[PDB]
């Protein structure tokens, strides 16, 4: 029952408090990682296990993209190929995307700041529109 | 870019290893479970290597679900065999490599495992014609 959290002070139960569609899409998260972390990421470093995690996420995504291109080349049948490509793109991404968001926000704003945001989203989600304030809670 | 090297070992060291060396994916998973059930799922943060094994187990759990899904859909039997064999054999090889490396690191000394990989790399190179039998065992 190895969770991908619990090492940073969070649980999959806490993560399952936000809408699935509300989180951003992968391209932005990959571009921002490449932006500034690229100098540090390649360089050998110690501590900050998010450092190792990120690499694992990147390698998994690369492995998934390699499988997609291979499926595209072979598997002459057209109908199944589109179904497989859509699945790999849409359904499986969510897990990696959540991982990337968690780690990028920790590395960019401290663990405690992230935890406060996680706990605060409860107010937003529970509140109905009449009670709910117009303003939605944003990172600072 | 390079998963290994974070600890002092490059992909080219592991590439030399034949396929027969690494055990099946199943014995390794049960090995890790029975041997470190307490340490892997623990609150204290330390022993950084547990990160690789706790990340790889979930990564392979993803592939197992994908195999189940491929099995349910794709009415054509022919494509199911192709996809299942690929996921089970080709993608898995990397998981075999990572799991073995990290388990050996955990149970055994680092300098020792690295010395084992550099020595083996030298032993395999050169033809089988002139080299004492057997393969250097980790001890």
């Amino acid at each position, epitope marked *: 029952d190895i969770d991908p959290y619990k090492e940073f002070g969070a649980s999959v139960e806490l993560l399952s408090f936000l809408p699935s569609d509300f989180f951003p899409s992968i391209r932005d998260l990959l571009d921002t990682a490449s932006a500034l972390y690229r100098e540090a990421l390649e360089s050998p470093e110690h501590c900050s296990p998010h450092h190792t995690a990120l690499r694992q996420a990147i390698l998994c995504w690369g492995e998934l993209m390699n499988l997609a291109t291979w499926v595209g080349s*072979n598997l002459e*049948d*057209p*109908a199944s190929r589109e179904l497989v490509v859509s699945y790999v793109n849409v359904n499986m991404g969510l897990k990696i995307r959540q991982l990337l968001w968690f780690h990028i926000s920790c590395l960019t704003f401290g663990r405690e700041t992230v935890l406060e945001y996680l706990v605060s989203f409860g107010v937003w989600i529970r509140t109905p529109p009449a009670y709910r304030p117009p303003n939605a809670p944003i990172l600072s | 870019i390079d998963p290994y090297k974070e600890f002092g070992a490059s992909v080219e060291l592991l590439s030399f290893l034949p396929s027969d060396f690494f055990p099946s994916i199943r014995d390794l998973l049960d090995t890790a479970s029975a041997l470190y059930r307490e340490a892997l799922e623990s609150p204290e943060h330390c022993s950084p290597h547990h990160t690789a094994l706790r990340q790889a187990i979930l990564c392979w759990g993803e592939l197992m679900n994908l195999a189940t899904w491929v099995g349910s859909n794709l009415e054509d039997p*022919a494509s199911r065999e192709l996809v299942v064999s690929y996921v089970n054999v080709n993608m898995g090889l990397k998981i075999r490599q990572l799991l073995w490396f990290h388990i050996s690191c955990l149970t055994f000394g680092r300098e020792t495992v690295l010395e084992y990989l550099v020595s083996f790399g030298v032993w395999i190179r050169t033809p089988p014609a002139y080299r004492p039998p057997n393969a250097p065992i980790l001890s």
Partner: antibody, heavy 119, light 113 residues
Framework: QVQLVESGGGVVQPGRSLRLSCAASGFNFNKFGMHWVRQVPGKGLEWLTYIWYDGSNADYVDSVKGRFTISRDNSINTLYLQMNSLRADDTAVYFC????????????WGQGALVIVSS | DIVMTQSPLSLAVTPGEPASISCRSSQTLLHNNGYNYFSWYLQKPGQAPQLLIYLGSNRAPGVSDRFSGSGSGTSFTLEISRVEAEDVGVYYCMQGRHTPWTFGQGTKVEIKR
């Protein structure tokens, strides 16, 4: 086992154009492709054309290239083959089949219908 | 585009004896999946065609074991261990590597008079 029944076959006067009916049931039409097979007496089978599930792509052989067209209506799960500029060499019995062994060889073949042209 | 070929054109078999028929293709059929796209069909007078061997070397469902085949690349052969009275017909081989699809010339069997 799927059962396919054709219709619309018969004699047609020379110079006109005719359309043949090939309907199928008992399996997922949207998930598989369709093919057309022809047999004039005295020779063997000959491949003519095929269409993919979406229908965006199609292919044709040089003998009838640019003069035959094929289309499908997924609402009713029915095949369609349109014939124009018929010749005396086109007198044959037509078969529509389906292939699912990894998109290579046809598996279930319909009963077929014969088309005859003469004055 | 592909030129198909079959041989021998005719072969009369005294039932109960084995026989072999050979079909040859110009261009290689080994795709990058390790598979070969080649077919074996059976056709009966007044009836629709029926499948014999699929994917080059795998028997089609429901087909009796009396028919077997193997081969790879540009050479293949159809082998029937024991000939039965219901085995009379004209046999075909087909290609599905590249579009457009092409058929062979045919092979009809009978009883030696």
């Amino acid at each position: 086992q799927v059962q396919l029944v054709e219709s619309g076959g018969g004699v047609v006067q020379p110079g006109r154009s005719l359309r043949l009916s090939c309907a199928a049931s008992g399996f997922n039409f949207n998930k598989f492709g369709m093919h057309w097979v022809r047999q004039v007496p005295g020779k063997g089978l000959e491949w003519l054309t095929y269409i993919w599930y979406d229908g965006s792509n199609a292919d044709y052989v040089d003998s009838v290239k640019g003069r035959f067209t094929i289309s499908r209506d997924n609402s009713i799960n029915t095949l369609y083959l349109q014939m124009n500029s018929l010749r005396a060499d086109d007198t044959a019995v037509y078969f529509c089949a389906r292939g699912f062994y990894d998109s290579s060889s046809l598996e279930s073949w319909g009963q077929g219908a014969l088309v005859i042209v003469s004055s | 585009d592909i030129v198909m070929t079959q041989s021998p054109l005719s072969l009369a078999v005294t039932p109960g004896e084995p026989a072999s028929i050979s079909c040859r293709s110009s261009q290689t059929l080994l795709h990058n999946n390790g598979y070969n796209y080649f077919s074996w069909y059976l056709q009966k007078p007044g009836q629709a065609p029926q499948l014999l061997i699929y994917l080059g070397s795998n028997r089609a469902p429901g087909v009796s074991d009396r028919f077997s085949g193997s081969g790879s690349g540009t050479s293949f052969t159809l082998e029937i261990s024991r000939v039965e009275a219901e085995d009379v017909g004209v046999y075909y081989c087909m290609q599905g590597r590249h579009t457009p699809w092409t058929f062979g010339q045919g092979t009809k069997v009978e009883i030696k008079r």
